[PDB]
Structure 1
Amino acid sequence: TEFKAGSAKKGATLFKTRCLQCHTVEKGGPHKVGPNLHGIFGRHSGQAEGYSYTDANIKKNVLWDENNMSEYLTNPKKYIPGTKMAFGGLKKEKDRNDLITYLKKASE
């Protein structure tokens, strides 16, 4: 697509190091600082299954596809202002593609 596709092994280590402290990927997942992200692609934002999101994450209500997700992970607070996801941003495109490719596979 507009976003290419990378290594799912590299993205695994990127998730483990930069996203795991707050998230899970598993079928029936331990909700943490952040939501369980299984089945993220194809669903809306603020879209629970049990979790307290800020009204900003709910009201943005965008379908999570590979492309708008990449724009989010570059700068979470610029894309969805007022969010409580304390993350600086993946500033390198390879890192975003390597991660989303792992995420698409892990959150199937």
Structure 2
Amino acid sequence: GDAAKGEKEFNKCKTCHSIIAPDGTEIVKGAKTGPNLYGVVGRTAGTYPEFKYKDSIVALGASGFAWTEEDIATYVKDPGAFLKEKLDDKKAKTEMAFKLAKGGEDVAAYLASVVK
């Protein structure tokens, strides 16, 4: 997708998320009520240290799942529907209460390029 446009679309994510490199460099200074999204491409779902996730997203990483750009793009359009489908569980719940109407792919490409 497009990284430069996804950078501008991350203005919907920064209200709960930041993007902080391991030495502390703040690539995006945002909030702290969602987890750090630096290196989230390729990382096991629900394992970022010192963050209390809801149980479904943890069970999703406990089965082997690591995020990809394409899964980020779909999850961000409707996080609770994503979780219900992958876990095959109607009761799957999510704490991320925000659905991105368009721009999933671009934000996803922007998150992969930020470590690079």
Measured against the shorter chain, the TM-score band is 0.7 to 0.9
- Segments of 4+ in structure 1 off by > 6 A? none
- What's the CA shift for 1:89? 2.7
Task: Tell me the equivalent position of 1:78.
Answer: 81
Q: CA RMSD in A?
A: 1.9
Counterpart among 61, 66, 70 of residue 69 in structure 2: 66
Cα distance in 1 between the residues matched to 2:48 and 2:110:
22
Task: Tell me the equivalent position of 2:45.
Answer: 45
Local SS of the residue matching 1:9? helix
Which amino acid letter does the alignment assign opposite residue 71 of structure 1? T
Counterpart among 18, 22, 29 of residue 24 in structure 1: 18
Cα distance in 2 between the residues matched to 1:97 and 1:70:
5
> Structure 2 vs 1, CA of residues 74 and 48 (structure 1 numbering), >3 Å: closer, same or farther?
same
Q: Normalising to structure 1: TM-score of the pair?
A: 0.80
> Structure 2 vs 1, CA of residues 79 and 33 (structure 1 numbering), >3 Å: closer, same or farther?
same
Unaligned runs of 5+ in 1: none
Q: Normalising to structure 2: TM-score of the pair?
A: 0.75
Percent of pairs identical after alignment? 31
Q: How many residues align?
A: 99
Cα distance in 1 between the residues matched to 2:115 and 2:76:
16
Unaligned runs of 5+ in 2: 84-91
1:33 aligns with 2:27: no
